[PDB]
């Protein structure tokens, strides 16, 4: 009996290191997975991204936190909305 997304209470507009890594090279899989769909490639990016020694992620996460920090800084100001029943309207 109420709608709600990831806008109120800790907004998550920016992208994640895995996103800027997946969505960025996804093209590399959409072009190399002619006999597949996307689940096959997706699994591939889930193995590499994790395997990463956090040596390169520190850069990505620093890119995700760089904006999420300045964004949520003044953007989160709208989080004043205390009343928020079950925040999850993703079907």
mmCIF file of C-alpha atoms in Angstrom:
data_model
loop_
_atom_site.group_PDB
_atom_site.id
_atom_site.type_symbol
_atom_site.label_atom_id
_atom_site.label_comp_id
_atom_site.label_asym_id
_atom_site.label_seq_id
_atom_site.Cartn_x
_atom_site.Cartn_y
_atom_site.Cartn_z
ATOM 1 C CA UNK A 1 0.000 0.000 0.000
ATOM 2 C CA UNK A 2 2.963 2.292 -0.668
ATOM 3 C CA UNK A 3 5.642 2.849 -3.310
ATOM 4 C CA UNK A 4 9.354 3.437 -2.726
ATOM 5 C CA UNK A 5 12.650 3.170 -4.607
ATOM 6 C CA UNK A 6 16.360 3.706 -3.895
ATOM 7 C CA UNK A 7 15.895 7.488 -3.901
ATOM 8 C CA UNK A 8 14.951 8.204 -0.245
ATOM 9 C CA UNK A 9 17.167 7.153 2.663
ATOM 10 C CA UNK A 10 20.698 6.688 1.325
ATOM 11 C CA UNK A 11 20.263 7.350 -2.434
ATOM 12 C CA UNK A 12 22.160 5.124 -4.867
ATOM 13 C CA UNK A 13 22.132 6.975 -8.190
ATOM 14 C CA UNK A 14 25.817 6.534 -9.194
ATOM 15 C CA UNK A 15 27.124 3.282 -10.657
ATOM 16 C CA UNK A 16 29.165 0.530 -9.013
ATOM 17 C CA UNK A 17 32.752 -0.519 -9.888
ATOM 18 C CA UNK A 18 31.344 -3.766 -11.266
ATOM 19 C CA UNK A 19 28.850 -1.733 -13.287
ATOM 20 C CA UNK A 20 31.426 0.584 -14.858
ATOM 21 C CA UNK A 21 33.378 -2.624 -15.515
ATOM 22 C CA UNK A 22 30.537 -4.822 -16.749
ATOM 23 C CA UNK A 23 28.458 -2.294 -18.649
ATOM 24 C CA UNK A 24 31.690 -0.907 -20.123
ATOM 25 C CA UNK A 25 33.131 -4.160 -21.485
ATOM 26 C CA UNK A 26 29.713 -5.802 -21.876
ATOM 27 C CA UNK A 27 29.973 -4.792 -25.506
ATOM 28 C CA UNK A 28 33.025 -7.029 -25.635
ATOM 29 C CA UNK A 29 30.723 -9.930 -24.745
ATOM 30 C CA UNK A 30 27.681 -8.875 -26.758
ATOM 31 C CA UNK A 31 29.979 -9.137 -29.744
ATOM 32 C CA UNK A 32 31.730 -12.334 -28.630
ATOM 33 C CA UNK A 33 28.598 -14.192 -27.471
ATOM 34 C CA UNK A 34 26.781 -14.831 -30.801
ATOM 35 C CA UNK A 35 25.879 -18.378 -29.767
ATOM 36 C CA UNK A 36 24.878 -17.282 -26.271
ATOM 37 C CA UNK A 37 22.551 -14.695 -24.710
ATOM 38 C CA UNK A 38 24.143 -12.741 -21.861
ATOM 39 C CA UNK A 39 24.031 -15.099 -18.884
ATOM 40 C CA UNK A 40 27.154 -16.867 -20.119
ATOM 41 C CA UNK A 41 29.169 -13.657 -20.401
ATOM 42 C CA UNK A 42 27.691 -12.263 -17.174
ATOM 43 C CA UNK A 43 29.122 -15.266 -15.324
ATOM 44 C CA UNK A 44 32.524 -14.505 -16.848
ATOM 45 C CA UNK A 45 32.549 -10.945 -15.504
ATOM 46 C CA UNK A 46 31.483 -12.241 -12.087
ATOM 47 C CA UNK A 47 34.556 -14.456 -11.890
ATOM 48 C CA UNK A 48 37.102 -11.891 -13.071
ATOM 49 C CA UNK A 49 35.764 -8.932 -11.097
ATOM 50 C CA UNK A 50 35.973 -10.960 -7.882
ATOM 51 C CA UNK A 51 39.306 -12.615 -8.664
ATOM 52 C CA UNK A 52 40.675 -9.057 -8.800
ATOM 53 C CA UNK A 53 43.196 -8.505 -5.946
ATOM 54 C CA UNK A 54 41.421 -5.242 -5.147
ATOM 55 C CA UNK A 55 44.541 -3.656 -6.643
ATOM 56 C CA UNK A 56 42.603 -2.324 -9.633
ATOM 57 C CA UNK A 57 39.229 -2.108 -7.882
ATOM 58 C CA UNK A 58 40.646 0.529 -5.547
ATOM 59 C CA UNK A 59 40.467 2.675 -8.672
ATOM 60 C CA UNK A 60 36.913 1.710 -9.609
ATOM 61 C CA UNK A 61 35.607 1.919 -6.049
ATOM 62 C CA UNK A 62 37.407 5.249 -5.808
ATOM 63 C CA UNK A 63 35.391 6.249 -8.856
ATOM 64 C CA UNK A 64 32.139 5.014 -7.341
ATOM 65 C CA UNK A 65 32.844 6.662 -3.987
ATOM 66 C CA UNK A 66 34.171 9.856 -5.569
ATOM 67 C CA UNK A 67 30.718 10.743 -6.887
ATOM 68 C CA UNK A 68 28.564 8.946 -4.310
ATOM 69 C CA UNK A 69 30.406 11.067 -1.764
ATOM 70 C CA UNK A 70 29.806 14.453 -3.386
ATOM 71 C CA UNK A 71 26.354 13.372 -4.581
ATOM 72 C CA UNK A 72 24.864 12.007 -1.357
ATOM 73 C CA UNK A 73 26.565 14.950 0.373
ATOM 74 C CA UNK A 74 23.875 17.488 -0.532
ATOM 75 C CA UNK A 75 21.572 15.119 -2.424
ATOM 76 C CA UNK A 76 20.934 12.962 0.648
ATOM 77 C CA UNK A 77 19.604 16.118 2.329
ATOM 78 C CA UNK A 78 16.209 15.017 0.989
ATOM 79 C CA UNK A 79 16.452 11.856 3.119
ATOM 80 C CA UNK A 80 14.644 13.781 5.884
ATOM 81 C CA UNK A 81 11.616 11.697 4.887
ATOM 82 C CA UNK A 82 11.459 9.521 8.003
ATOM 83 C CA UNK A 83 8.276 7.564 7.073
ATOM 84 C CA UNK A 84 9.418 4.913 4.596
ATOM 85 C CA UNK A 85 7.667 1.537 4.695
ATOM 86 C CA UNK A 86 9.592 -1.320 3.036
ATOM 87 C CA UNK A 87 11.893 0.478 0.593
ATOM 88 C CA UNK A 88 11.951 -1.852 -2.414
ATOM 89 C CA UNK A 89 9.754 -1.270 -5.465
ATOM 90 C CA UNK A 90 11.609 -3.538 -7.889
ATOM 91 C CA UNK A 91 8.678 -5.874 -8.536
#
